């Protein structure tokens, strides 16, 4: 109905909308992190996290705080509200894409764009988890259905899905029948970002811009570094699923699922946003 | 004191959710208007005219329409804004008049605002139960100035806010 406010500027790699607020917190690769609590058409703060670019934005999970990543390689959580830094560690050799907050003993998970992501105890000091299975440059890192199960999208042309543990990664199982992750007609490839057969999914599509998950589900909706943004369901795994998402002119940087909407929104580069179904598609 | 230039106020304000509270009210104000602020203020007419013309021309709003004669109506408006009409000529605000009324006021943070409004005026089958008089508003910024013309426009009549 109305586009309340609109100025075109910002060169934007990472993004998030406030699930609680009508904020948009926006990550630019201008090196900028911004929180604007978008409501009153006003920015609360604006820090260009470092000289270098900024790729990442993720939620802490609480109410109004950012966990932020730059080419600093640092995980910062700073509360806009409390304008202060919660606990601090820098980052490996690339930026931080996703974060989750937990609390047996007020306990923490950090998801990263490089190498490993490490999950840390500052209370009764022990190890909840270690994640290796990333390399460099994560476009879109994701919590899964199980929130603390996860997927990652890479500029290392892989995807990682990991299994975690309370004493590092492992799963025990023995009942299933076939798999959709990989087990009948169609299915898409493994990539390499880690080295355990959970599934490293192939992020080659000239590299993957975005990865997006299906909560209980393993369908992914993707942005890809190909015109082809190729959609695959690992809750099916169709053939002509070797779908290349097509503009008219080039690209499909991203195409995304809206939690509520059984739809795909695509956006591209001929000057465009392209409109897609996904209810009958 | 405290300059904040967020005009007409309407500036976001916070009551916070910070303790037995998960939310609260963040509010921007509205309800902050002019008609009140300015006080009446005065001038020599020749100089005035000269000045009238001279001033920040840039705003005007029209008077036309009401519920009253500009006797009672004018008085009401005057009191409402707390502002001045500088001088009469007896020509007659009665039989018609076919009077243009010059008004001046000075405020609390000191802007002087000038008006010439020229107005028809009530009287049987003669003229005035509208106006179609033009209210010429001069205040330095047009933005407040016109806004003032409005504000007065709000002021002008009496109806469901």
UniProtKB/Swiss-Prot annotation, chain A:
Ranges for the WD repeats: 7-37, 49-79, 91-121, 133-163, 203-233, 247-277
Residue numbers carrying Phosphothreonine: 185
Domain of life: Eukaryota
UniProt modified residues of type Phosphoserine: 173
Compartment annotation: Cytoplasm; Golgi apparatus membrane; Cytoplasmic vesicle, COPI-coated vesicle membrane
Subunit structure, as described in the record: Oligomeric complex that consists of at least the alpha, beta, beta', gamma, delta, epsilon and zeta subunits. Interacts with SCYL1. Interacts with JAGN1. Interacts with TMEM41B. Interacts with SVEP1. Probably interacts with PEX11A.
Function: The coatomer is a cytosolic protein complex that binds to dilysine motifs and reversibly associates with Golgi non-clathrin-coated vesicles, which further mediate biosynthetic protein transport from the ER, via the Golgi up to the trans Golgi network. Coatomer complex is required for budding from Golgi membranes, and is essential for the retrograde Golgi-to-ER transport of dilysine-tagged proteins. Xenin stimulates exocrine pancreatic secretion. It inhibits pentagastrin-stimulated secretion of acid, to induce exocrine pancreatic secretion and to affect small and large intestinal motility. In the gut, xenin interacts with the neurotensin receptor.
Protein name listed in UniProt: Coatomer subunit alpha
Organism from which the protein derives: Mus musculus (Mouse)
The organism's taxonomic lineage, starting at the top: Eukaryota, Metazoa, Chordata, Craniata, Vertebrata
Full-length numbering of the shown residues: 1 to 281 of 1224
UniProtKB/Swiss-Prot annotation, chain B:
Location of the protein in the cell: Cytoplasm; Golgi apparatus membrane; Cytoplasmic vesicle, COPI-coated vesicle membrane; Cell membrane
Tissue expression profile of the protein: Predominantly expressed in the upper one-third of the oxyntic mucosa and in most regions of the pyloric mucosa. Ubiquitously expressed including platelet, liver, heart, spleen, lung and kidney.
Taxonomy, superkingdom: Eukaryota
Function: The coatomer is a cytosolic protein complex that binds to dilysine motifs and reversibly associates with Golgi non-clathrin-coated vesicles, which further mediate biosynthetic protein transport from the ER, via the Golgi up to the trans Golgi network. Coatomer complex is required for budding from Golgi membranes, and is essential for the retrograde Golgi-to-ER transport of dilysine-tagged proteins.
Miscellaneous remark of the record: Brefeldin A induces dissociation from the Golgi of the beta-COP and presumably the other coatomer subunits.
Assembly with partners or alone: Oligomeric complex that consists of at least the alpha, beta, beta', gamma, delta, epsilon and zeta subunits. Interacts with CAPN8. Interacts with SCYL1 and PRKCE. Interacts with COPG1. Interacts with ARF1 (myristoylated); this interaction is required for binding of COPB1 to Golgi membranes. Interacts (via trunk domain) with ARF1 (via switch I region); the interaction is direct. Interacts with KCNK2 (via N-terminus); this interaction increases the channel-mediated whole cell currents and promotes plasma membrane expression of KCNK2. Interacts with STX17. Interacts with TMEM115.
Record's protein name: Coatomer subunit beta
Shown part of the complete sequence: 793 to 953 of 953
């Amino acid at each position: 109905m109305l586009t309340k406010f609109e100025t075109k500027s910002a060169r934007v790699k990472g993004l998030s909308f406030h699930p609680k607020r009508p904020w948009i917190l926006t990550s630019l690769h201008n090196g900028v992190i911004q929180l604007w609590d978008y409501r009153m058409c006003t920015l609360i703060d604006k820090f260009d996290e470092h000289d270098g670019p900024v790729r990442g934005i993720d939620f802490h999970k609480q109410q109004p705080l950012f966990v932020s990543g730059g080419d600093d390689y640092k995980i910062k959580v700073w509360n806009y509200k409390l304008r202060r830094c919660l606990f601090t560690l820098l980052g490996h050799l690339d930026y931080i894409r996703t974060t989750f907050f937990h609390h047996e003993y007020p306990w923490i998970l950090s998801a990263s764009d490089d190498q490993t992501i490490r999950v840390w105890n500052w209370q009764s000091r022990t190890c909840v988890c270690v994640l290796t299975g990333h390399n460099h440059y994560v476009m879109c890192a994701q919590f899964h259905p199980s929130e603390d199960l996860v997927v990652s999208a890479s500029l290392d042309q892989t995807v990682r899905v990991w299994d975690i543990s309370g004493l590092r990664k492992k799963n025990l199982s023995p009942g299933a029948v076939e798999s959709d992750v990989r087990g009948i007609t169609g299915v898409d490839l493994f990539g390499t970002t880690d080295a355990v057969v959970k599934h490293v999914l192939e992020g080659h599509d000239r590299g993957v811009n975005w990865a997006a998950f299906h909560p209980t589900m393993p369908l992914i909706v993707s942005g890809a570094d190909d015109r082809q943004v190729k959609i695959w369901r690992m809750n099916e795994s169709k053939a002509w699923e070797v779908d290349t998402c097509r503009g008219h002119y080039n690209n499909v940087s991203c195409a995304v699922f809206h939690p509520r909407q059984e739809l795909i929104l695509s956006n591209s580069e001929d000057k465009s946003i392209r409109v897609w179904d996904m209810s009958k598609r | 004191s405290t300059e904040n230039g967020i005009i007409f106020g309407n500036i976001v304000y916070d009551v916070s959710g910070a303790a037995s509270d998960r939310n609260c009210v963040v509010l921007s104000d509205i309800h902050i208007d002019i008609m009140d602020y300015i006080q009446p203020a005065t001038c020599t007419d020749a100089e005035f005219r000269q000045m009238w013309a001279e001033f920040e021309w840039e705003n005007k709003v029209t008077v036309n329409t009401n519920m009253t004669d500009l006797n009672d109506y004018l008085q009401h408006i005057l009191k409402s804004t707390n502002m001045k009409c500088l001088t009469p000529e007896k020509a007659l605000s009665g039989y018609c008049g076919f009077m243009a009324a010059n008004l001046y006021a000075r405020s609390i943070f000191g802007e002087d605002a000038l008006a010439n409004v020229s107005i028809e005026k009530p009287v049987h089958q003669g003229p005035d139960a509208a106006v179609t008089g033009h209210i010429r508003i001069r205040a330095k910024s047009q933005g407040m100035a016109l806004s003032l013309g409005d504000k007065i426009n709000l002021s002008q009549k009496k109806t469901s806010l």
